[PDB]
Amino acid sequence: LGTVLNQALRTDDSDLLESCLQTLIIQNTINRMDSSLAGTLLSKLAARMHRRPGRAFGLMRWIQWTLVAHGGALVTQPDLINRLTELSRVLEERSRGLSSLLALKGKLDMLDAQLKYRKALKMAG
């Protein structure tokens, strides 16, 4: 799907972008794809990072493998740092609550664990 990727990103496609993002072959596609198109991908996936932060299982692995196969593209053309610089502000909004997002779980996950016991009293009852 690497040529599909290349096509989509040099005409600025979103439907073809979504066709590639719905689907291992991720590794295959990014080691297939090219360099400045990987920078274009990085920019608009940052847009995605902002506009929809739900389950990240696919696309954050995708930017991993993007920086794997063609992370060295944007040192060889470094002038577009604001491609990366604009990732570089989203990340710390993305960690604000982590000052207490584990302080979330432990008081709550025990209350979880209390019903696991109150279940365990009753299915034998």
């Binding site: 930017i63 920086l67 060295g72 470094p78 990366l84 610089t85 982590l98």
Partner: protein
């Protein structure tokens, strides 16, 4: 000045027994620095003295001696009262100093005052804009804040002021410590009310969108988790909770992946910025070792421009001489390099073009 304030309090007592609330309130405006115009900020308020604050709250609020009294609005319609609300003078320390005479024998006065005061404010203001202003302006305790959120939830569970008040009280109880919130909230709530507050923050989380996917927080943290610790095991004795902890786990693993990739994109942006610096200097012609291929150097290292300072014994610093600077550019040179001179160099104007072998 003590005799002066005693005479002023006696004159205000004379105004009270004459029931001259208009002139009394104008004296209050003169002290606080009727029209009663407002500065449009909770912050920029003139500093007022504790004796006038304590006399004001003494006159406004009341108590009932039956071994358990109750503040009442002696002045339910009062610009002085809404000024105390917006300036944040309605603290438990303030009202205990106000009613030092009759609260000396009653216990649990923090719980009593912090429960009763927002209920009093709510029956004053059904629009509860005064309540949200109190929430934003006053130093609040845990019982005060949980009764405030209780009033907001019986109000809801022209439609945005209550939500802003919810957010403000969420920030403040996120600030408050866990133990006091847990004990006072075990006191003041019922497990069904805790379930409604739980669903409120569930909606808050899922509207922030951490579960609804990509490719289609401390506040709520402290609030939702501390309140369920408050209710504890006495409440429930299901699959609601099962799906609930499932989406909790989705959000957790999402944030973990987020920190992993936080690190990598942070260092990538930093190295790309230093690479912009180095390739700017290389286009200038300072002949630094930077990468040439389209792949990342395994060492995320760049050749910085030479520090013009030279550290000497013992800690003294003299500037680097051009001799050693040339020694350093020489060691930075590689094994094979094409170093083309220009005729602009030969006349003395421009610089060369350097291309070293990729090391």
């Amino acid at each position: 000045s003590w005799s002066e304030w005693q005479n002023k309090a006696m004159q205000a007592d004379e105004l009270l027994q004459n029931n001259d609330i208009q002139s009394w309130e104008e004296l209050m405006a003169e002290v606080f620095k009727p029209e009663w115009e407002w500065p449009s900020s909770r912050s920029d308020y003139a500093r007022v003295d504790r004796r006038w604050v304590v006399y004001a709250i003494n006159k406004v609020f009341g108590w009932e001696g039956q071994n358990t009294g109750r503040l009442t609005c002696r002045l339910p319609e009062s610009s002085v009262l809404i000024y105390l609300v917006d300036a944040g003078h309605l603290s438990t320390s303030n009202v205990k100093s106000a009613f030092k005479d009759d609260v000396r024998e009653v216990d649990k006065v923090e719980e009593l005052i912090g429960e009763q005061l927002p209920i009093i404010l709510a029956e004053v203001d059904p629009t509860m804009e005064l309540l949200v202003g109190y929430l934003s302006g006053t130093q609040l305790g845990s019982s005060e804040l949980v009764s405030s959120i209780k009033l907001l939830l019986c109000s809801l569970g022209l439609d945005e002021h209550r939500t802003r008040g919810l957010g403000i009280a969420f920030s403040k109880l996120a600030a408050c410590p866990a133990a006091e919130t847990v004990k006072s909230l075990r006191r003041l709530f019922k497990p069904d009310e805790v379930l409604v507050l739980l669903n409120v923050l569930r909606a808050e989380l899922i509207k922030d969108g951490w579960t609804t996917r990509y490719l289609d927080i401390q506040l709520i943290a402290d609030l939702m988790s501390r309140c369920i610790d408050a209710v504890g095991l006495s409440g429930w004795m299901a699959n609601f909770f099962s799906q609930f902890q499932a989406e909790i786990s989705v959000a957790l693993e999402g944030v973990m992946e987020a920190v992993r990739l936080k690190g990598v994109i942070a260092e990538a942006a930093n190295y790309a910025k230093r690479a912009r610096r180095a390739l700017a200097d290389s286009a200038k012609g300072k002949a630094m070792t930077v990468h040439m291929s389209a792949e990342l150097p395994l060492g995320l290292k760049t050749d910085n421009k030479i520090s013009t300072e030279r550290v000497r014994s013992g800690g003294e610093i003299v500037a680097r001489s051009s001799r050693q600077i040339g020694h350093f550019i020489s060691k930075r040179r590689g094994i094979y390099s094409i170093h083309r001179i220009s005729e602009e160099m030969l006349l003395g104007a421009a610089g060369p073009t350097v291309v070293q072998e990729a090391r």
